[PDB]
Amino acid sequence: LLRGFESSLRGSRVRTQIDDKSFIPYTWQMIDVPLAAAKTSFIAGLDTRQ
Amino acid sequence: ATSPAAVLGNTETVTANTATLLTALNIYAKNYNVLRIMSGMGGLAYAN
Incomplete structure (x- = not known):
């Protein structure tokens, strides 16, 4: 509870993560x-002229 | 053109001096073509 919590550090x-997945399925x-x-x-x- | 005697009493081959202002000529031709509609699309059978 006090040390096993998930945090959004560097890399997260x-x-x-927004550049790899295209917006094609959502639009x-x-x-x-x-x-x-x-x-x-x-x-x-x-072209009946000639 | 400013003198009715000349405007109205003249001959077949003459007209008003003001007729020289009629410098534009528009020539029209009305023709047939075929507008084809098929499979959801229109088009013209004759290109030229």
Whole structure:
């Protein structure tokens, strides 16, 4: 109780603990919708000029 | 242009001296194209 207590010494407040784990799971949403990926020949046209 | 006798009594081939101020020409053409919609996306069949 008086000597076996945990304390946040040096190394416990290192910055890499926030630098190693990305923020991707806390900000990105599970979209689960397919990407567009439409072709260019369909949108631009057939170029009937020549 | 300031004289109605000249403005109103004139011939087919002439106009007002103030017609020289009509220096802009706008030419329009209205055409057809095809707006295709498929798989959630739009596009134009004819590029040019």
